[PDB]
C-alpha cells in the first residue's frame, strides 16, 4: 500500500507491488481519478519519477506518499 | 480570487509539501514569497531558494506570475529569476495550486530541458560535460543559496 | 447541502459510489453508479428521477 496526493489535494490509497513499474501505477491512478497517464507526473523527494523505472528502483517503501502534478515541459 | 488564495494558504499553513513553503509577504494577500529547498542528491542540496508570487485578479483563471529571487544555475531559469515553464503560461490549469506549482518547479530543478533553453550558454554545459555543469550549480548554491 | 447525497452508495445496487451521470439535454442527475446508469439507458428506461429520456451516461470523477 502507498498513498498518492492528487492534483486537487485529496489523498488516495494504492495497493502496489514493490517491483511495480511507474507506468502501471499511473495506469492505476487513471482508473481511480480518470487522468491519462500521459498527463501525470509523479514526484517524490522533489524529483520526478520516470515511467520505465519501478517503485523498487526509486526506493518506495510501504506507506510512502507520492505527489501528483500535471505533465510539464521546461523551455 | 481571495477566497481561493485564502484556501491555499490555510492548507499550506497546516500541511505543506515535503520541501516548500509559501505565504504572503506582509499585508498583501496577492503577493507571496515562497521557499523551495534544494532536492537531496542534486547540485542544489542544502540551498534555500526564495521566489516571488504575484496572483492576478482573475486567479486562478490566469496563472500566478512566479520568479526566483534567489540566484540559481539552470538552463530554464535566467538571471532575472524568470522561469520558462509551460504550466506558467500555455499549459496552466486552474486546478493547479501554489503547492503543486512549487513542487513542479523542484522537479524541474532535477530534470531540466537543454533542448529548448532559456539560457543557451548553460544548455551547452549541461549537454557536453555534466560534471562541470553540476560543479557550477553546486558553487552557485553555496555562494548565492545559503 | 444536498451535496451530501454523493456520499451515499448507488441508490440501486448500493455496492458502488454514484459515478454515473444520467444526462438529458444540458442537465444530469447523479444518483447511481456508472454501471446501473448504463443499464437503465440500455433497457430503454428513462431517468429514475425526472423521467426524462436518457441521452447519455458518463462516468464522473470527483475532483
Amino acid at each position: 500500500q502507498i498513498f498518492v496526493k492528487t492534483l486537487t489535494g485529496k489523498t488516495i490509497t494504492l495497493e502496489v507491488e514493490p517491483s511495480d513499474t511507474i507506468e502501471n501505477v499511473k495506469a492505476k491512478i487513471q482508473d481511480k481519478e480518470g487522468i491519462p497517464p500521459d498527463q501525470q507526473r509523479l514526484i517524490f523527494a522533489g524529483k520526478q519519477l520516470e515511467d520505465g523505472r519501478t517503485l523498487s528502483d526509486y526506493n518506495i517503501q510501504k506507506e510512502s506518499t507520492l505527489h501528483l502534478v500535471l505533465r510539464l515541459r521546461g523551455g | 480570487a481571495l477566497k481561493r488564495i485564502h484556501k491555499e494558504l490555510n492548507d499550506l499553513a497546516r500541511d505543506p509539501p515535503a520541501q516548500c513553503r509559501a505565504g504572503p509577504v506582509g499585508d498583501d494577500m496577492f503577493h507571496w514569497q515562497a521557499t523551495i529547498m534544494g532536492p537531496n542528491d542534486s547540485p542544489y542540496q542544502g540551498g534555500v531558494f526564495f521566489l516571488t508570487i504575484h496572483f492576478p485578479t482573475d486567479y486562478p483563471f490566469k496563472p500566478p506570475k512566479v520568479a526566483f529571487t534567489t540566484r540559481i544555475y539552470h538552463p530554464n531559469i535566467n538571471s532575472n529569476g524568470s522561469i520558462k515553464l509551460d504550466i506558467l503560461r500555455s499549459q496552466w490549469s486552474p486546478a493547479l495550486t501554489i503547492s503543486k506549482v512549487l513542487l513542479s518547479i523542484c522537479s524541474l530543478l532535477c530534470d531540466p530541458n537543454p533542448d529548448d533553453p532559456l539560457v543557451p550558454e548553460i544548455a551547452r554545459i549541461y549537454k557536453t560535460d555534466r560534471e562541470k555543469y553540476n560543479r557550477i550549480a553546486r558553487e552557485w548554491t553555496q555562494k548565492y543559496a545559503m | 447541502e444536498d451535496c451530501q447525497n454523493l456520499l451515499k452508495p448507488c441508490s440501486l445496487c448500493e455496492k458502488r459510489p454514484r459515478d454515473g451521470n444520467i444526462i438529458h439535454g444540458r442537465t444530469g442527475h447523479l444518483v447511481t453508479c456508472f454501471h446501473c446508469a448504463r443499464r437503465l439507458k440500455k433497457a430503454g428506461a428513462s431517468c429514475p428521477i425526472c423521467k426524462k429520456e436518457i441521452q447519455l451516461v458518463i462516468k464522473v470523477f470527483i475532483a
Binding site: 480518470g34 | 481561493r4 483563471f61 | 454514484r18 444526462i23 442527475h29 464522473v60 470527483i62
Partner: protein, 63 residues
C-alpha cells in the same frame, strides 16, 4: 477522502457547490460550479484536471 471532496465547494471560485460537470467522451470531471465551468468552455480552455477538450458542461443535480 471522498467526504472531503464531494462536499468541498468549487475549486475555482470556492463559493459554490460543484454542480458543473465537465464532459469529455465517456467521462467527466466534477470539480467546478456551473458558472466557473461555463467560463472554461466559453473561453475554449480544456478540462483543468485531465486536460482533455471539453465537449460540454452539464448542470448536475444529486437528490
Amino acid at each position: 477522502s471522498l467526504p472531503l471532496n464531494a462536499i468541498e465547494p468549487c475549486v475555482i471560485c470556492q463559493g459554490r457547490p460543484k454542480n458543473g460537470c465537465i464532459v469529455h467522451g465517456k467521462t467527466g470531471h466534477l470539480m467546478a460550479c456551473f458558472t466557473c465551468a461555463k467560463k472554461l468552455k466559453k473561453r475554449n480552455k480544456p478540462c483543468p484536471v485531465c486536460r482533455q477538450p471539453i465537449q460540454m458542461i452539464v448542470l448536475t443535480y444529486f437528490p
